[PDB]
Amino acid sequence: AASGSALIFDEEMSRYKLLWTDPECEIEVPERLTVSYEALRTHGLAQRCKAVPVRQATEQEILLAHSEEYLEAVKQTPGMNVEELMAFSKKYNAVYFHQNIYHCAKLAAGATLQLVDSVMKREVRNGMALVRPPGHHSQRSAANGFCVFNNVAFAALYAKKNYNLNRILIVDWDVHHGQGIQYCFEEDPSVLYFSWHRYEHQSFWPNLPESDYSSVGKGKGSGFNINLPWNKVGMTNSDYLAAFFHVLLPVAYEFDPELVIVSAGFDSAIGDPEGEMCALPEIFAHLTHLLMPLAAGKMCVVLEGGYNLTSLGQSVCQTVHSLLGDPTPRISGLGTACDSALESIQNVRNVQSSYWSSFKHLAQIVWPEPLKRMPASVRTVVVPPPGVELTLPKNCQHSISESTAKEVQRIRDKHFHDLTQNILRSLGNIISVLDRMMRSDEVCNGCVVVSDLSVSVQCALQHALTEPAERVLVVYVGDGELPVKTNDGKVFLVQICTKETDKCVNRLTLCLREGESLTAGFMQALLGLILPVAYEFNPALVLGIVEETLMRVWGHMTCLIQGLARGRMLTLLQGYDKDLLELTVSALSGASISPLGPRAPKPEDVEMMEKQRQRLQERWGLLRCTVSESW
Numbered sequence: 001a002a003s004g005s006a007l008i009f010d011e012e013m014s015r016y017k018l019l020w021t022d023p024e025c026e027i028e029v030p031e032r033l034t035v036s037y038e039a040l041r042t043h044g045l046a047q048r049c050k051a052v053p054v055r056q057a058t059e060q061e062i063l064l065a066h067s068e069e070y071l072e073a074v075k076q077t078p079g080m081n082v083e084e085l086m087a088f089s090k091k092y093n094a095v096y097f098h099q100n101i102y103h104c105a106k107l108a109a110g111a112t113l114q115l116v117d118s119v120m121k122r123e124v125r126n127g128m129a130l131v132r133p134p135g136h137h138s139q140r141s142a143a144n145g146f147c148v149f150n151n152v153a154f155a156a157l158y159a160k161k162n163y164n165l166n167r168i169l170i171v172d173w174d175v176h177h178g179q180g181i182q183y184c185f186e187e188d189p190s191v192l193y194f195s196w197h198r199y200e201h202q203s204f205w206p207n208l209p210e211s212d213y214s215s216v217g218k219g220k221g222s223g224f225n226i227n228l229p230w231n232k233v234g235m236t237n238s239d240y241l242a243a244f245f246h247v248l249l250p251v252a253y254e255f256d257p258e259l260v261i262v263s264a265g266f267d268s269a270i271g272d273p274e275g276e277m278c279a280l281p282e283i284f285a286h287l288t289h290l291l292m293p294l295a296a297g298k299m300c301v302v303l304e305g306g307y308n309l310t311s312l313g314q315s316v317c318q319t320v321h322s323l324l325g326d327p328t329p330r331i332s333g334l335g336t337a338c339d340s341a342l343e344s345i346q347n348v349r350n351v352q353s354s355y356w357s358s359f360k361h362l363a364q365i366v367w368p369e370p371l372k373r374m375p376a377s378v379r380t381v382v383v384p385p386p387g388v389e390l391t392l393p394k395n396c397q398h399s400i401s402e403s404t405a406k407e408v409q410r411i412r413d414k415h416f417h418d419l420t421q422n423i424l425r426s427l428g429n430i431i432s433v434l435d436r437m438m439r440s441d442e443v444c445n446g447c448v449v450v451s452d453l454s455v456s457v458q459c460a461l462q463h464a465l466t467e468p469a470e471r472v473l474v475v476y477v478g479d480g481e482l483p484v485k486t487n488d489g490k491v492f493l494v495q496i497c498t499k500e501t502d503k504c505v506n507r508l509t510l511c512l513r514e515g516e517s518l519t520a521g522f523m524q525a526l527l528g529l530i531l532p533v534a535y536e537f538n539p540a541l542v543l544g545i546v547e548e549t550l551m552r553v554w555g556h557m558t559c560l561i562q563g564l565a566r567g568r569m570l571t572l573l574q575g576y577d578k579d580l581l582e583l584t585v586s587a588l589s590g591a592s593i594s595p596l597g598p599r600a601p602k603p604e605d606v607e608m609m610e611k612q613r614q615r616l617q618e619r620w621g622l623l624r625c626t627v628s629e630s631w
């Protein structure tokens, strides 16, 4: 029932700054905050957010994660002059203090707690806090790397204590390692910490052996710390998405968190003078979107770093766009991760393979401005069988024009001479829905219930190609063979079937053993095969097809597959099924997805899937999770 996105912000956190010469520190400026909020305002996103106010973290709250001694020290800095503040600043690494920073640090922390409470109370679905100072470097008794108190560590400790959560996921996509967070939960299996970071074989700050992939946690916490070191600069969209598909997401969906907190540093985006990576701001729309099916969408995004004032606003906007449910922008030019990324990916997977099921099987600048992302007028159109009313969410709608009807006549009087049930109606619905999706910019996606599969599939696919749709991704659940030509490179077919068998690289056929393991195997294939191929293909439309002949998984796929084609997906359900039609519509409309919870996949399925990767990854490089064997 939760709706809306929170945006926690306050101009007071911009009212402390660096007061002496320090080339390391001078990058951390108030304008980082003012530029990010103003960019949200300009694109109309802040106005669409629930503005929860900041508060101070209390002393007892600060003590959840920091020592009394350290608090008492920081608590004296408001009374210090500049010389005393400089002298106190030098007790720590890469951090400066100011007369007002203790105030601002309590506000940065309290804002984070406000965001946790609004999400966990169901007052909003998700949200973002724009805070200074950042948090993820700060430690139990030390300020570090512009950080005073550990905002995101607070949040998970506070969520644990006050909502009795057993499993919290922290995703730290800042370009620096959040070592403060690692230490905090080093031994804690209830908080899973994932971080990627510029490492360069430990030569990049903070220069820690424990930022490497071999730090999997300690004690009961082994396997709940996941470090992915970047050992070269210039990482791209493809490296970031490879990290999610082949490390983070497989673990995240098996973990099944009850809350997601994001250390959202954007110094990992192109143009940042500190990260020196090359991922576009648009990628953050997808990093955000790929995590939203977790924890019924309960996601708290907390600003960490980001220093190119221009790159910064754009990446903040893409994140909030996705939190609000706006359609994701198309990512073009995707392919294999670079060799350094695949080495890091391969290494982290191997060492984590003793702890996680998905990996367990191999223990045996200038850039173009992002487009506009307006949500469609109505998001989802539904076409149930004739004379079936259904309770539809507020952003959905039922379906047939004269021109449209003339076209159905032309298609019958050419390709189906002898056809006369109410199929002609479904064909007119397919065409009119597609026309509103592709050309009209009015609706986003839709679902139509159909009788005859061949004529509707053929006519949906063919009509989509001439919209025009450069490329069409087809996802079909059924053991038949469809009127789909995968020979010109304009179509890629994914088939989830029961029969045993493909011989070309434009079809992925998944024959999952029937049983209780069907759900884990499906999610394994979704994250590690279907999504990487689909993202590289970069379709202009997704065509989902379900034949009337075990799909507690369909909602997740519908949700994740809307990362492609700007969310333009048309689903054909053969035969009426109230439940499946309602779940399809609900996921299509942007509703939150119910968690899967917990049963490991059959090795027959794992072996079947790895044969598919071996067969496809030379053509679709985003499938790779090992370095290529060189001849």
Ligand SMILES: CN(C)CCc1cn(Cc2ccc(C(=O)NO)cc2)c2ccccc12
Pocket (backbone or CB within 6 Å): 023, 024, 025, 094, 134, 137, 145, 146, 174, 175, 176, 205, 265, 267, 273, 274, 304, 305, 306
């Ligand atoms: C001029 N540039 C190229 C480097 C200047 C420079 C900043 N720091 C500190 C620092 C701390 C935290 C974050 C962050 O974003 N955390 O999330 C970013 C930087 C250094 C440390 C060691 C050597 C150089 C530097």
Ligand SMILES: [K+]
Pocket (backbone or CB within 6 Å): 172, 173, 174, 175, 176, 177, 178, 195, 196, 197
């Ligand atoms: K990080």
Ligand SMILES: [K+]
Pocket (backbone or CB within 6 Å): 185, 186, 187, 188, 189, 190, 191, 192, 193, 217, 221, 224, 225
């Ligand atoms: K941990």
Ligand SMILES: [Zn+2]
Pocket (backbone or CB within 6 Å): 174, 175, 176, 265, 267, 304, 305, 306
């Ligand atoms: Zn950083």
